[PDB]
Amino acid sequence: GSHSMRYFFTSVSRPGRGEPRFIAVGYVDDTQFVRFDSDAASQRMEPRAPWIEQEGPEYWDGETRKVKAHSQTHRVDLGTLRGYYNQSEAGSHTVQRMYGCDVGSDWRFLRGYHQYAYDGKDYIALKEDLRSWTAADMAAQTTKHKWEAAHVAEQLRAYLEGTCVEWLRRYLENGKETLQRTDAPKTHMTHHAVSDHEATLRCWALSFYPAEITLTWQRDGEDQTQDTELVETRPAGDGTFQKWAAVVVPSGQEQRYTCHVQHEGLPKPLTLRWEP
Amino acid sequence: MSQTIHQWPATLVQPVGSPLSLECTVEGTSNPNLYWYRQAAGRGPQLLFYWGPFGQISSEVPQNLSASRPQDRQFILSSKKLLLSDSGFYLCAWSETGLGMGGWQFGEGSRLTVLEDLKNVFPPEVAVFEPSEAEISHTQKATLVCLATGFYPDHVELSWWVNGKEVHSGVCTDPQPLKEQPALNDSRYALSSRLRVSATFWQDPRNHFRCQVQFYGLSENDEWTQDRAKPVTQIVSAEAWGRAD
Amino acid sequence: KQEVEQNSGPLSVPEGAIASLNCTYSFLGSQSFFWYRQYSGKSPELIMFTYREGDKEDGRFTAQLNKASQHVSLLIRDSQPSDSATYLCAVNDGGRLTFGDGTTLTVKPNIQNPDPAVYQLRDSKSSDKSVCLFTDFDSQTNVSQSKDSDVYITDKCVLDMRSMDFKSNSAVAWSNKSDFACANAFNNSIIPEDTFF
């Protein structure tokens, strides 16, 4: 299937305490593999997955330098943006950046991304063509003109389409046991009345990987998205994911409903149905 | 139109145990990345310190050196007590803030020579040799030769001046000096250059030729015990006038 | 070191020829590459940078990148004596540049009409030295040291009298000893004229 590599950066200015808090995190698909936190004693890019610890000290040193360079650029940006938005030195402000790769089932480049946000809103993004910039407002125009004069897109074009995929391929190979696996969801179903003539049947999907999964009920053919309020997919904490859907119905009959689960780890889509 | 970088001093000769202070200044960019590299002969520059706009990024640890950035565009390399090992060509460089292609340029470099014993220091004796009539007649050109001899350490900047203005056409200066006594580790050095002009220009007694050699030596206050006058940094020159056949 | 490898040279190239300089790096994650030119006694000066596969030309200079083999090249078209120097290859391995030790290039000038000769010059001052000058020889003539510690002989160096569109090779030799004479001063000459009253 498809895969991706993404880097997320957040810098928050704390005027009064000290330098901004900076936190960087890297992911391959739904797996975090590295992190950096400006407030940690470490002051190094650290691994968060076994397969990345195989990279030598040269790699780590390089990643550490780059990530710190990212941090200091965000520091300069925070000071520039106040100016642009004519804001004071008092409040706390946030700068976020994200970029990465998408490859298909053949591991070839599908698309790249490089986006930047200020105080939670889009500030400037690189378009799908990897050559044009989408500047949200007037301040962002100043930035797009300076990034155009320096050919930032062309540089990102080289990184997103070449380096990012080359390393995405490398990581998928080195961490094949983890990244190319597929954990099928373990499922079960509970049931207990809330009052006479009322009972909530609840379906579960646990320990599954990747995170992409569909959990829907059916009396028969849905036809449209049913009113069943499904909880947002969440991380188990051990690298897997979980998600449950629940329905209230007439106590008596309970064979009217059937929970359906669809995941990449399952060849045939599951169809659970039991009346406790 | 004007992105600049300069370092100072250009050349230093100091004794073991003395302090060091090299300076680097940039102009035309703000919040740049600043770097200190040191280069040894026959080798590529080797990184010492890499500072971002707000502090050091490299975890590198030179033995007897420290860096500081007392201003956005001012970078300093220091040492409280120099080691012989510290001899080298110190280079400062800058790159635009972030990680891009802007900049990546070096200052002019600071040549540092740390000496064990200062009594080995000698300025160059300079002598100019006038063209031979045989050359003038076989060809129609006249070559003067300037000879800077007996100097130590091994750096001097030779220069030719014709009638008050420095000249470059027809000038050929040896790239490196030769050891006067190759077997000796502390041998003194020599350097030569040629200045070639048409026989007509030489034959004019109106023309004044001067070979000038800037030498880098000890400072006024360096410890000294020898009988001879202290060999401080000085310009040594020799002159010749045109001769009518 | 071994992170960035370049032959050391000296690499000779005839004037007008293309000089090709090669570099091999070992750091897989290197994302940009640079070439510097460094003249004797000077700091390095940027020639080019590149961050993509293929060729990148800037005037007479052409940088070539092949990430698969981690090879970087530099071609100098129409080589001149003025480009004699040490060319440094540098790789950006994360926020900084790491350097090779360089390859020293020597471009031999093409001497049109040579007339090798050894002349003796006296000084305008009273010095115990006498100097001998071997000049106007073909660029294929190599000068060597004397089999005598008392005499000194420089390497050959090229001067350009821009006014006559004339280039020229030289070598100086000297000695404070009386014995020393210009007739025996050099070794492996090329039938120059040895003048004398």
Partner: peptide
Amino acid sequence: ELAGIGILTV
């Protein structure tokens, strides 16, 4: 592998 180029101040 972090981007080592194309990262500049706004």
